[PDB]
Amino acid sequence: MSFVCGISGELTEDPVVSQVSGHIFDRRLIVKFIAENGTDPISHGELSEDQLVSLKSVSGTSIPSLLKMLQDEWDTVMLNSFSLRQQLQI
């Protein structure tokens, strides 16, 4: 796989995850950030060298995405029907 570096938006070749944010960084950038500032530029957390857990890792729309689509549509039908019940009872 390949990933986008959250420091800069470039492609990532040694991916590591910021545990406090889930952001993926290239090791070559975040390590010097840890050296010079100890933080990450979006979440502004506190992070340390040991937290850089490395990453080591179909055509149709998968079933969970389709069930979420149906659940999203259901939510609108309920929110509509609530408003109509609200008017009708008044």
Binding site: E73, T76, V77, L79, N80, S83, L84, Q87, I90
Partner: peptide
């Protein structure tokens, strides 16, 4: 004294 109903509140372009 009552609001006019928007019968299409919350609905998506699909549900319309």
């Amino acid at each position: 004294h009552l609001p006019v109903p928007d019968y299409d509140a919350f609905l998506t372009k699909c549900m319309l």
